[PDB]
Design a protein around this ligand. Structure first.
Ligand SMILES: CCCCCCCCCCCCCCCCCC(=O)OC[C@H](COP(=O)([O-])OCC[N+](C)(C)C)OC(=O)CCCCCCCCCCCCCCCCC
Ligand SMILES: CCCCCCCCCCCCCCCCCC(=O)OC[C@H](COP(=O)(O)OCCN)OC(=O)CCCCCCCCCCCCCCCCC
Ligand SMILES: CCCCCCCCCCCCCCCCCC(=O)OC[C@H](COP(=O)(O)OCCN)OC(=O)CCCCCCCCCCCCCCCCC
Ligand SMILES: CCCCCCCCCCCCCCCCCC(=O)O[C@@H](COC(=O)CCCCCCCCCCCCCCC)COP(=O)(O)OC[C@H](O)CO
Ligand SMILES: CCCCCCCCCCCCCC(=O)O
Lengths: 60, 128, 459, 172, 173, 124, 64, 182, 43, 182, 71, 122
């Protein structure tokens, strides 16, 4: 997990939008969904992050 | 305090709050007593072939062979046509097939009518 | 051809009069040699189909199948030679006779120039297979399975025979060339509607299409391994070769009539792969897996667009080499445990290390990773289907998601787990098994470099 | 078999204490709340009526079930634990060694020779275990899942091969 | 190289003059210099030895031409021989026009990377060139089916001026 | 007791309780420990669904209905005012980007022949 | 020595054949290796045309 | 067309060398993990160079090579795109994967299949590298599925752990739903 | 007992652990800012 | 007991917060400043601010329980980090967290729109929310030291089993789809 | 079998600590602060908000071009 | 800013909606407002490969920034004075925006309180 699921494999998803960034700005509806999806993802993962009792789960 | 743990088909009721173990009669003890015995006969038998040096084969589980039969062959001969099965056959069968037919046909009619008038434009779409 | 058909026929007296025990040796020698000769036909000219004689010709679609069939012939020999080594010399010689004869019909069928000649040998493949599934089968349901396979194929093929001779009387010659250059508009009419249905149903049953497919789980599972490959690896594609040739005349009626077949294949492929998600026989698992892949070929043909035909042949060849592999895999366990239940022999990577690796790439090829030829075929159909209709990507991808679960499911259930305690007869894999598996997967990954050879007649 | 009440209440004490471990965390807090848990169990110990004991259990099991930690602490070498069957994938059965090639068989002459002694010992004692079973079967088949020991001398315990020759919990 | 700019227009390079005011040395000069003297030079030495070895034994190859043959617009109906000559020529014309689009796509892709940030406006000439190619290729070959033939191509073609004749006659009024 | 005779073809197969293999006593001896299964015990009709690496019916501490109510509430509660954030967007006391050369029409993929209407910005 | 032979058989000879691949094989094919034009600035001359790019004019002394 | 073209492309070729070397068994079975780490270290230091011309020259590359198929009017072929996002991600990824590989020696010093584990890590790195260096969407899909399957094996590395396969099945399941949009 | 007595006693506070090394970090600043002042005076 | 490992953890935890001029600062609070100065989806902006404060929250839990407290492990302590591979691996990455945030930001060409003129109050909210998150999380974590009896909050339950997500997701549709299959 | 254990196990006692780990931890835990204050001193403006934000209210209508209410 | 509360909770009429402002002619009421200019001519502006969102009027404060950054390499700690100049110049065109934002804001109640002013007495 330290290699794949930390900084070198899960990065693929965000990296894909970075590749298609020049086409991203033309649309307005979808790009709002990206920041919308990131917003809920941040809280809910962090909300479940604090109340965990395993070191691996907290970092995940 | 905190109201109880109602179960579900997916979240079953635990054995720690089940009334069966909290209200027992001698008859229930008699029935559950030799549950080990019927399992011991299965276990003692299975151990006997398993620990047998002369046994150089696989030990067949008649329950397992029965399960494969029950899931593969003992289905149609035991099938009985009833309105419940008949309706479920139509609802899970021809139903969705026509559902996709209506959805796709409408889209094709929508697409076909649109490019005929000249609504969609594929000035750069060539390969298809 | 004569240069492949004659050596194929000449293997028949060779095996019959061969030495007592050298039958497996010599038959494997020249069958590999004949496959090497058939590599010559992989070349195709610019646009005109490779024509040798009046009755025989090849194109950029038949030849990729021709090499697949002749390359398959050695594989059935080694796979079947395990259990066949315990019967009479005549019985073993009769089997090799029958595979040689069965392959002979396939080579002559794929290069047939006259549609009637195509139909004669296309249906003639039933006799060598039917006896294989029945006589040398290792169960009891084979007796019913053989009848199911024979009657389903014949019940659809017979309308084709009546339809085919009708074209002969009305249009004239039925050569695959003269049909193409003299294509006439098949206008919409009730007589033409049944004309369309007759010329199509025969090949649909042998795909098989969703609903006309119950012969496959019976035929494939009960058949011997030398057969269990061909009923899944070549002659299903024989129905495919029939579709791509007969649809030369069925325009433009095909698009108006294709809707029941598309919906049946496009929706049924989700249901068929759902069967694989919950199965009990490993052979049945792969069998229903073949139905899902062939169902994807069924929809692929009917759009009749350049991309679809390419992805049709790409998946058609790749699946055959793949589905043949998995049947070898299920064979190895079925010999060691003498049962087909999945959960009986859980845990093989612990005991057989390389068998897991071969199982890994076998289940990976069915998983169709890029750039594996399975993926290069399915991806092409998805783009072609999406251009036809945008909604179909929901159905097309759903199988791609669903096919991942079951394709890795026997990998988890059989390999990745605790070894079963009671089983004690597992042996270190014979070098025949591993060599056979390499003969399956090495050409597949090697084929990845040059997909142009197998991409079809529209590259 | 039939789990009697005094066992079941002990199961509650063992499991509830392990659950407050996931709650109390700090050791000093553990030792305090454990003593209150312990003595509050002992305060009601003269109930001559066994029905009242289950009535006391009628609220304890629900008390445990809602006060249980949603992420209880279980040691890794156990079900639910992070190291459950982690090293199982190396537990190759010992009978597989009989299929080793002679070159590998000759690689370890001493262990293989001793394996032959165990195999010969197992062969001799198997039939000895067999008649031992039917010499003392309970009338009506094996009543209990338990297994009788070796009654006489020079006899290995019945059904000993798999238990004795099981792979080590740390095979590597 | 091995082509002409008229087929693959690559605008002349515009390389700056590196003048680092800072006294500390530019490392990128050093790794480039050592690369030439440790990798590039032996590669060139092997290449020239390879090139002269090829030059000793020069075997030549030429390019195949196909003389123009009557197409299917003058092919007589049911004339199977002129059917084949026309069909093969049209499919050969299909392959070259497919490569014509292939060339334009390569130029457009080169237009993007070469301009980098300025891809939007610097070579919009490439975009309109591909617009003309793709649109004409659409009415020339697209939607012909997996069994396309010169008869079908005329059928699609005939649909155009027939529709065009109706439109212009309506337009003339 | 067998399954109900709905005509589904279940036959006389026993209707074992719908309880996954996860609900087994791990410390109890199992002939198939990877499935917590003994020998000859008539296995469930849907064993390949309730197997260890599949659907598990182990009891969660909190009730299933409350489990649905909180989850279905949270996603709807969060999504619903994701929309009201859109109808009341957050912006700063600042106007739009005053861009040069009529919003860079030539550089924004505009047609050079079509002269953009004059868009010029002044001091403020 | 272990590091030196490692560099030869894992860094030297691999980049050797890639350089040959990317100097004579692909380079003989157009539009296979394309880069963004070297982003130049007004000021420094261009090496080929030999003409200093006209520098911009005066900025309105917008000093901090 | 500087060494920035060829030298940045050979970084992948250095990475894939241990994969080929594994099947030949010439590698000493004791010191295979050391073989992998110093190989990545060599690639890492080799991958520093693409940075220096990135800040200095501000140049980016697109490296197309051997033609796969001239499919109709598309030219599907192997191709790489050096750019801002690429030329620095590999040095970061190589530096990270080098550090953990050194750490993995101490942590995994008892797993009997340690040579296999290091083989999986390199294969993942190769799949990730071609993911970040891709010019056509099909090549992007090669990594987009290569890393997903590589995660599946590596998550189920402990194999016999019953729940590990569930997570391994879970990882590919959620990935496939993601590949729906791809 | 041992979980509190012995060397396991006197565990630093949360914030106290956060400034671990600040005892020498501030000293590093002093000599560093001194060099900057000396360089400033040199110019 | 574990000086270097604890030291590395504090550095990594502080990078999660984004302490100024450290690796975390050069990206994270630049985003938070950037997201403030934009036409965002109101409710989307608030969640990140709650999230970035929440980043410090679980960060304390890691440092508090694991390090700052009295030992609770089994009696036989095998604590050891003296192995050179472990030290070298962490050391190589650790210098990458003290630095390389300043290095990359300065080295990369300036090519993003700079938010220069913001009102002061939201300029350093990232430091406020982290410090605010640090203060109350420490107090709530230290509240466990208090001998007070614990009451299982239903809100704590919702957080602890991962928002009730796994038991609905990984149990209901899996059953329904598999049930439909049979 | 053979040795090679610089550390030794401890039973309910503080584990043995060596020199190398201690000052290695101290060095980096100190130089992290060294980076913290050094960059703060040189670039306090980055976190402070070097560029002030003018108060909108104080901007009078004259330079704002707002013609008065008399029109 | 604080105007958001006065726009949603308060009457949104008095507050601008950045989507469509400006609405009234900015030159109206402005005696000879000075026309913006940029020294960086387009072809060299396009030459610098300068990103579209970074192509404002003060974009010429990048061309020297990149020039020094290019030439001063490998010294990255340098190129600070001109970089600060660009940021300071980014200050200037940015403060220009809340001037016109405020002007739109101030002309909003101006027109509106006028609307009921010259209408209530009649
Ligand atoms: C110049 C030449 C350099 C050496 C080339 C060596 C070969 C090579 O790598 O070629 C690369 C070439 C690349 O072509 P290219 O266009 O890049 O040009 C080559 C020259 N270079 C690389 C320098 C530019 O590709 C191929 O040759 C394709 C290889 C395909 C291999 C397929 C093997 C199939 C085997 C099947 C066995 C089973 C048969 C029966 C079953 C059939 C299926 C059902
Ligand atoms: C404007 C800026 C606002 C910034 C807010 C920052 C909030 C930071 C998080 C505070 C709450 C979480 C917390 O303190 O967690 C630490 C702790 C863990 O307690 P627990 O898991 O029960 O373990 C006890 C063991 N004896 O103690 C606890 O009390 C855990 C509490 C768990 C539930 C937390 C719910 C937080 C909800 C936040 C808002 C979500 C959206 C609405
Ligand atoms: C936005 C909304 C998106 C849709 C929401 C759907 C919620 C359900 C998602 C299913 C999650 C994956 C899954 O099958 O998990 C079940 C299980 C893992 O269970 P777990 O709780 O991790 O416990 C493992 C043992 N400790 O893992 C297994 O059981 C693995 C083996 C069986 C896998 C069967 C998977 C079938 C999935 C069918 C999905 C059909 C519907 C898809 C809908 C979304 C489409 C985009
Ligand atoms: C097992 C059940 C069938 C399975 C599925 C089979 C395929 C479905 C279609 C079934 C009909 C197949 C027979 C087709 C014969 C040739 C078709 C053909 O070329 O088209 C002719 C049309 O074919 C027919 O007319 C016959 C086929 C239609 C269906 C009627 C007969 C078949 C159904 C009953 C027998 C089969 C069913 C099983 C019975 C036990 C055109 O001739 P025409 O009608 O234009 O003749 C000139 C003039 O107009 C008047 O003749
Ligand atoms: C002391 C208070 C500091 C600011 C706290 C709230 C930060 C988020 C809301 C403001 C965001 C920027 C302004 C808007 O517009």
């Amino acid at each position: 997990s330290a290699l794949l699921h930390s900084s070198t494999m899960v990065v693929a998803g965000v990296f894909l939008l970075i590749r298609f960034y020049p086409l991203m700005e033309t649309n307005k509806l979808v790009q709002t969904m990206t920041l919308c999806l990131g917003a809920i993802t941040t809280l809910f993962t962090a909300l479940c992050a604090i109340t965990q009792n395993d070191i691996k789960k907290i970092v995940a | 305090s905190f109201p109880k743990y109602k179960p579900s088909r997916l979240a079953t009721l635990p054995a720690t709050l089940d009334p069966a173990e909290y209200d027992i009669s001698p008859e229930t003890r008699k029935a559950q007593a030799e549950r080990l015995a019927i399992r011991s006969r299965l276990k003692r038998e299975y151990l006997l072939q398993y620990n047998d040096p002369n046994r150089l084969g696989v030990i067949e589980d008649p329950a397992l062979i029965r399960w494969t039969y029950a899931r593969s062959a003992n289905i149609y001969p035991n099938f009985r046509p009833t309105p419940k099965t008949s309706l479920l056959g139509a609802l899970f069968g021809i139903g969705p097939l026509f559902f996709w037919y209506y959805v796709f046909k409408t889209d094709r009619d929508k697409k076909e009518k649109l490019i005929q008038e000249g609504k969609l434009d594929q000035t750069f779409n060539i390969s298809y | 051809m004569l240069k492949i058909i004659i050596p194929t026929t000449m293997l028949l007296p060779m095996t019959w009069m061969s030495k007592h025990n050298m039958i497996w040796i010599n038959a494997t020698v020249h069958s590999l040699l004949i496959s090497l000769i058939s590599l010559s036909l992989l070349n195709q000219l610019g646009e005109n189909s490779l024509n040798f004689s009046l009755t025989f010709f090849s194109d950029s679609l038949s030849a990729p199948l021709l090499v697949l069939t002749t390359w398959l012939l050695p594989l059935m020999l080694m796979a079947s030679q395990s259990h066949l080594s315990k019967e009479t010399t005549t019985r073993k010689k009769l089997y090799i006779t029958m595979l040689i004869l069965l392959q002979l019909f396939l080579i002559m069928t794929f290069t047939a120039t006259e549609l009637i000649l195509f139909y004669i040998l296309f249906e003639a493949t039933l006799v060598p297979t039917l006896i294989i599934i029945t006589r040398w089968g290792n169960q009891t349901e084979r007796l019913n399975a053989g009848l199911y396979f024979l009657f389903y194929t014949l019940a659809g093929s017979l309308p084709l025979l009546v339809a085919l001779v009708y074209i002969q009387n009305t249009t004239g010659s039925l050569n695959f060339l003269i049909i193409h250059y003299w294509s006439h508009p098949l206008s919409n009419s009730w007589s033409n509607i049944f004309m369309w249905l007759a010329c199509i149903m025969a090949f649909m049953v042998k795909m098989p299409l969703y609903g006309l497919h119950l012969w496959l789980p019976k035929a494939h599972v009960e058949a011997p391994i030398a057969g269990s490959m061909v009923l899944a690896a070549v002659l299903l594609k024989l129905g495919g070769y029939g579709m791509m040739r007969i649809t030369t005349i069925l325009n433009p009626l095909t698009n108006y009539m294709a809707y029941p077949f598309l919906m049946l294949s496009m929706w049924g492929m989700i249901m068929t792969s759902s069967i694989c998600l919950r199965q009990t026989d490993l052979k049945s698992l792969i069998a229903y897996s073949s139905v899902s892949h062939m169902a994807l070929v069924i929809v692929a043909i009917m759009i009749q667009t350049p991309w679809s035909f390419m992805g049709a042949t790409a998946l058609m060849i790749a699946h055959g080499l793949t589905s043949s592999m998995l049947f070898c895999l299920a064979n190895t366990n079925y010999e060691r445990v003498h049962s087909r239940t999945m959960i009986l022999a859980r845990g093989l990577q612990t005991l057989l290390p390389l068998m897991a690796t071969w199982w890994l790439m076998a289940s990976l090829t069915n998983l169709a990773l890029p750039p594996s030829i399975n993926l290069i075929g399915e991806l092409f159909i998805i783009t072609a289907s999406f251009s036809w209709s945008n909604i179909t990507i929901i159905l097309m991808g759903m199988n791609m998601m669903i096919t991942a679960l079951y394709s890795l499911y026997m990998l988890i259930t059989t390999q990745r787990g605790k070894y079963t305690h009671h089983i004690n007869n597992i042996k270190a894999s014979f070098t025949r098994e591993n060599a056979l598996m390499a003969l399956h997967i090495l050409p597949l990954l090697l084929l990845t470099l040059n997909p142009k050879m197998i991409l079809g007649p529209l590259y | 078999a039939y789990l009697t009440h005094q066992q079941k209440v002990l199961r509650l004490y063992k499991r509830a204490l392990r659950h407050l471990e996931s709650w109390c965390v700090h050791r000093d807090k553990y030792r305090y709340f454990a003593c209150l848990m312990r003595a509050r169990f002992d305060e009601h110990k003269n109930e001559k009526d066994m029905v009242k004991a289950t009535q006391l259990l009628r609220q304890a099991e629900e008390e445990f079930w809602y006060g249980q930690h949603p992420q209880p602490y279980i040691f890794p070498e156990s079900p639910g634990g992070t190291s459950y069957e982690r090293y199982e994938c190396y537990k190759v059965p010992e009978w597989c060694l009989d299929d080793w090639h002679p070159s590998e068989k000759a690689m370890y002459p001493d262990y293989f020779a001793k394996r032959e002694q165990w195999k010969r010992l197992r062969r001799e004692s198997w039939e000895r275990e067999v008649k031992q079973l039917q010499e003392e079967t309970p009338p009506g088949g094996p009543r209990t899942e338990a297994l009788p020991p070796a009654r006489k001398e020079g006899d290995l315990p019945p059904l000993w091969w798999h238990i004795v020759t099981r792979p080590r919990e740390r095979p590597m | 190289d091995s082509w002409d700019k008229d087929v693959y227009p690559e605008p002349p390079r515009r390389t700056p003059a590196p003048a680092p005011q800072t006294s500390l040395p530019n490392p990128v000069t050093y790794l480039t210099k050592i690369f030439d003297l440790l990798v590039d030079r032996p590669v060139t030495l092997a290449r020239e030895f390879i090139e002269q070895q090829h030059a000793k034994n020069r075997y030549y190859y030429y390019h195949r031409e196909f003389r123009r043959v009557p197409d299917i617009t003058e092919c007589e109906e049911k004339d199977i021989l002129c059917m084949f000559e026309a069909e093969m020529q049209w499919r050969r014309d299909y392959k070259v026009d497919q490569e014509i689009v292939n060339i334009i796509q390569e130029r457009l892709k080169a237009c993007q990377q070469r301009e980098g940030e300025s891809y939007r406006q610097n070579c919009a000439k490439e975009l309109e060139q591909f617009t003309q190619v793709s649109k004409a290729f659409q009415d020339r070959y697209s939607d012909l089916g997996a069994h396309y033939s010169a008869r079908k191509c005329l059928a699609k073609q005939k649909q155009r001026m027939l529709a065009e004749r109706k439109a212009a006659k309506e337009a003339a009024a | 007791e067998p399954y109900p005779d709905d005509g589904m073809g279940y036959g006389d197969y026993p209707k074992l309780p719908d309880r996954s293999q996860q609900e087994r006593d791990p410390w109890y001896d199992w002939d198939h420990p990877d499935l917590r299964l003994n020998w000859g015990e008539p296995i469930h009709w849907d064993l390949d669904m309730y197997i260890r690496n599949r659907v598990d019916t182990s009891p969660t501490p909190v009730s299933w209905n409350t489990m649905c109510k909180h989850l279905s509430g949270f996603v709807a509660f969060m999504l619903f005012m994701f929309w009201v954030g859109e109808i009341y967007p957050s912006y700063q006391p600042v106007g739009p980007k005053q861009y040069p050369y009529n919003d860079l029409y030539l550089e924004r993929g505009g047609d050079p022949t079509k002269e953009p209407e004059p868009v010029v910005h002044y001091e403020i | 020595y272990r590091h030196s032979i490692f560099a030869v058989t894992h860094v030297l000879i691999p980049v050797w054949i890639i350089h040959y691949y990317l100097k004579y094989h692909v380079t003989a094919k157009p539009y296979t290796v394309v880069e963004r034009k070297p982003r130049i600035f007004p000021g420094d001359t261009i090496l080929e045309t030999g003409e200093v790019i006209p520098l911009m004019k005066e900025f309105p002394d917008q000093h901090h | 067309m500087n060494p920035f073209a060829s030298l940045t492309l050979t970084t992948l070729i250095i990475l894939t060398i241990p994969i080929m070397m594994s099947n030949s068994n010439i590698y000493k079975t004791n010191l295979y993990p050391n073989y992998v780490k110093t190989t990545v270290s060599y690639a890492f230091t080799l991958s520093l160079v693409p940075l220096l011309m990135f800040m200095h020259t501000g140049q980016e590359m697109i490296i197309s090579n051997w033609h796969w198929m001239t499919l109709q009017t598309v030219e599907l072929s192997l191709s790489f795109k050096m750019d801002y996002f690429s030329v620095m991600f590999i040095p970061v990824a190589l530096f990270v994967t080098w550090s953990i590989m050194e750490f993995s020696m101490w942590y995994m010093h008892s797993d009997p299949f340690i040579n296999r584990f290091f083989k999986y890590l390199v294969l993942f790195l190769i799949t990730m590298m071609i993911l970040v260096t891709a010019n056509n969407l099909f090549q992007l899909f090669i990594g987009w599925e290569g890393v997903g399957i590589m995660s599946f094996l590596l998550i189920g590395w402990w194999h016999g752990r019953t729940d590990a396969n569930t997570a391994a099945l879970q990882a590919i399941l959620y990935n496939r739903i993601g590949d729906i949009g791809f | 007992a041992w979980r509190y007595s012995g060397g396991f006693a006197n565990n630093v506070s949360f914030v106290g652990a956060l400034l671990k090394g600040f005892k020498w970090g501030f000293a590093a600043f002093v000599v560093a800012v001194g060099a900057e002042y000396y360089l400033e005076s040199q110019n | 007991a574990m000086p270097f490992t604890t030291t590395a953890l504090i550095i990594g935890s502080l990078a999660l917060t984004g302490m100024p001029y450290l690796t975390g600062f050069y990206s994270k609070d630049l985003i938070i400043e950037a997201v403030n100065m934009s036409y965002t989806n109101a409710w989307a902006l608030l969640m990140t601010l709650i999230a970035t404060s929440l980043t410090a929250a679980y960060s304390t839990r890691i440092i508090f329980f694991a390090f700052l407290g009295k030992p609770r492990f089994p009696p036989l302590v095998l604590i050891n980090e003296n192995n050179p591979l472990l030290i070298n691996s962490i050391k190589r990455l650790l210098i990458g967290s003290i630095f390389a945030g300043f290095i990359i930001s300065n080295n990369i060409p300036p090519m993003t729109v700079p938010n220069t003129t913001m009102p002061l109050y939201m300029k350093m909210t990232a430091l406020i929310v982290t410090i605010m998150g640090f203060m109350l999380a420490l107090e709530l974590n230290n509240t466990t030291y208090y001998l007070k009896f614990k009451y299982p909050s239903q809100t704590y339950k919702f957080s602890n089993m991962l928002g009730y997500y796994p038991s609905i997701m990984h149990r209901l549709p899996t059953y329904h789809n598999l049930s439909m299959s049979q | 079998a053979g040795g090679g254990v610089h550390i030794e196990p401890r039973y309910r006692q503080f584990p043995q600590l060596t020199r190398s780990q201690l000052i290695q931890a101290e060095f980096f835990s100190a130089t992290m602060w060294f980076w913290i204050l050094w960059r703060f001193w040189h670039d306090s403006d980055a976190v402070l908000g070097h560029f002030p934000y003018p108060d909108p209210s104080q901007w009078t209508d004259e330079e704002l071009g707002i013609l008065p209410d008399d029109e | 800013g604080a105007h958001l509360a006065r726009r949603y909770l308060g009457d949104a009429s008095k507050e601008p909606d950045p989507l469509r402002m400006p609405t009234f002619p900015p030159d109206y009421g402005f005696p000879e407002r000075k026309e913006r200019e940029m020294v960086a001519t387009q072809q060299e502006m396009n030459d610098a490969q300068l990103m579209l969102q970074q192509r404002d009027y003060c974009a010429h404060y990048l061309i020297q920034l990149l020039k020094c950054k290019r030439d001063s390499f490998p010294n990255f700690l340098a190129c600070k004075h001109e970089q600060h100049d660009w940021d300071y110049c980014e200050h200037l065109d940015y403060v220009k925006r809340m001037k016109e934002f405020e002007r739109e804001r101030r002309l909003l109640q101006r027109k509106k309180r006028r609307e009921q002013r010259e209408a209530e007495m009649a």
